[PDB]
Design a protein around this ligand. Sequence first.
Ligand SMILES: *Cc1c(COP(=O)(O)O)cnc(C)c1O
Ligand SMILES: *Cc1c(COP(=O)(O)O)cnc(C)c1O
Lengths: 435, 435
Amino acid sequence: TTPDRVHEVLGRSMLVDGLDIVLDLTRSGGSYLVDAITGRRYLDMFTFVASSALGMNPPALVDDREFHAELMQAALNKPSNSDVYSVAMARFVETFARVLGDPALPHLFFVEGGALAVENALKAAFDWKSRHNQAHGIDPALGTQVLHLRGAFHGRSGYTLSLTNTKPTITARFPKFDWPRIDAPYMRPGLDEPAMAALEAEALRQARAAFETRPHDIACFVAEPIQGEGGDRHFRPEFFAAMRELCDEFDALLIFDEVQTGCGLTGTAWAYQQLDVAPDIVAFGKKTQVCGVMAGRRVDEVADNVFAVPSRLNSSWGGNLTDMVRARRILEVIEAEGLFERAVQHGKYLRARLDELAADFPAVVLDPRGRGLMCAFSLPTTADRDELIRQLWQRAVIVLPAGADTVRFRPPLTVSTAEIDAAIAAVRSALPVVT
Amino acid sequence: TTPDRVHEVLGRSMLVDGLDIVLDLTRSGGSYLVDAITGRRYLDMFTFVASSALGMNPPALVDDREFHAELMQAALNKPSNSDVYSVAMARFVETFARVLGDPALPHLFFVEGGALAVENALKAAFDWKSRHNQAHGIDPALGTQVLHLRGAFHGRSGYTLSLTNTKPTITARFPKFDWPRIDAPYMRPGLDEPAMAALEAEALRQARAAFETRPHDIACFVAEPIQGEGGDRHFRPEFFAAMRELCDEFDALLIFDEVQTGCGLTGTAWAYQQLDVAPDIVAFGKKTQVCGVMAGRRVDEVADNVFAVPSRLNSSWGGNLTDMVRARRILEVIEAEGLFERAVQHGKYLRARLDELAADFPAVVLDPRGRGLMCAFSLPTTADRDELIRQLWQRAVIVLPAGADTVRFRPPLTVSTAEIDAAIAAVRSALPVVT
Ligand SMILES: *Cc1c(COP(=O)(O)O)cnc(C)c1O
Ligand SMILES: *Cc1c(COP(=O)(O)O)cnc(C)c1O
């Protein structure tokens, strides 16, 4: 099978709606994807839907002969880490705890897939609430509902389909639980402090109303600290702090879905660290390669919780050992090279350029925004947005759409300022064409 | 981190309830796991919960220098196969279709994880039923329920938690849909043809009753062709053939969950091929490394089904590329070495030995059964069963429990008759001790 036959071969078995290239696995490197058909290089602001921290074939992994041996060792087989432990696994878990750990959240659980990471956070919360109810004389059949936001994306699995509400295509015709959903009071341009406070107070009102009309039945509140797929919607720290207080008042856990924001993209290990809100459970994935949850805070108040009792949470594999070994090495690079700090500084650079774009194209480049390297801007209509992405593609720059009118940037943590300049130059070239 | 410190390090972050060994990734081979602490060798009848087809470090993979290069290439990174295609991916898909494909089921979809494979089969069915309803003047809000069996195990995710019913520990305190569940008419010892027919007719009655009391609302019937976790319960081909007819009468899809039975364990690619029943959708995983579904038959009658319309099914990664590359090579070994046929012959050998065990220990070794290499027997009580497993462990043989009183054998497809003899000898030694 040859690069030029890839789309034909796949097309016999599956819907083939992806990018028009064939990935060269060997010649791709850093912030560049190589099309194996033409040899053309593509500037990567997409990073496998934000799942690549270092970009392709990072030198620290490719040149490391000892790591090669460890990776091969892991890659040849696929143990069930659920019941069979290894040195390779233990090294990963200890470096995860060191680099990404929170002392308040000591319980770690790993699984393949971001939606299932979120599901395990939910299951922890369902169990916690039922048992907390039981211990205080409340019916243990209560504690089965999930408070969540409009415009949320938490995945495409049985429980997360009841939470995700972006494109109808994702959720239509699939059975859902009737769980309480509230307005998302995200920052928008031309809203001052009092205006934002009023917006938040209304979501808070709706949240409080949900807790009071469904007594002892809401197990948790789940949120993205910054909504990704819904359109890079950012929230003030004040909103989540108010939600944190309200969750505690009604004995509900706070879960942050950091599958997209996590592992250094915003400039810290986790976006929540910048919002000064302490969650009870964090779900992670994408850049971490292996997915899962970190849990603690109020979780430990229920002694027979899901992390203390055998066989409550499980999967056959307990995550992919190859992913663990690769992630261990990635985390070591992040720590050794100070990549979180690099994300803060280069994020400030990218944001500044998007502000300049807004100044030069004020009716077209709307609402430039970001935290660290997680940046975006919007266009007047979805047609403009879709056209801009096509024009960037022709110029060999890969970016992703979000929501109705957003273009999002997801560069690797190792992106250089020259590479950011190249992406901005491509946007400047394309804009007169779309107008 | 040293082998003797593995359990200590992991114990700081997670519940450590697995096997008492530390896996030596390099020295393990074939039907033997090596404990890195002692160097003791363990006879493997467990195969990472039936997910390993060839056992550890098979020579055809370890000695193949070209494959090493391909595997390393895939292992260094983790592309989103959902939107970025590669030669490595296309080679996998084409060899999967060749070795495991069914001409009636041309639609292939891949995902990480067995439960999510089953969930995607369900989602295909929900969409199919709603749209089939709509096209025949029936309310498209109908078609949201799943007919399933008692003692079923389909996973631990949002939708499969509503199906799985083995140990209460797996499902307790998690929100479920109220879906119709019927008795499982599995073969048991000392039941003749008429007795079995009577048992099946009763399950059939219950199935028919479910279809009639929930009109147009049952999207599919899902089953394991042989129930694994529930206790290796086998069904006559007559039962599923009757279910096949009944599904067609009420316009519902038939889904086989072949995550445990699949990829050659029973002697054919899929267990369903031996039962002479044609499903509409098959979910697969474990031995396949990448998980997913094959779909066709009645699925294609709805033109805008989930395999024809973009973005209805998805995950970020679209399965693990390292898993695909390893699976491609495994499938090539299976095909080149005739491993399906090897499973039939060695399965007959194993079964014969378990019959001899039943003859020598008639009050203790109960209900010897199996299809190909998927074999089991039961003990009088769960205490006897648990003790037998402890006694086998002391003798360095790894087997798994199932249900209340079953011991299951899950050898690799490459198991030799001498290795089967060794496992049987260990059982013979242990039995007088348990009695
Ligand atoms: C994409 C993502 C998920 C789902 O992860 P998958 O691996 O595709 O299942 C969940 N939450 C957020 C915020 C995500 O970005
Ligand atoms: C174990 C298994 C699954 C679940 O697979 P996971 O990878 O653990 O999610 C589903 N169905 C059957 C029959 C299984 O054996």
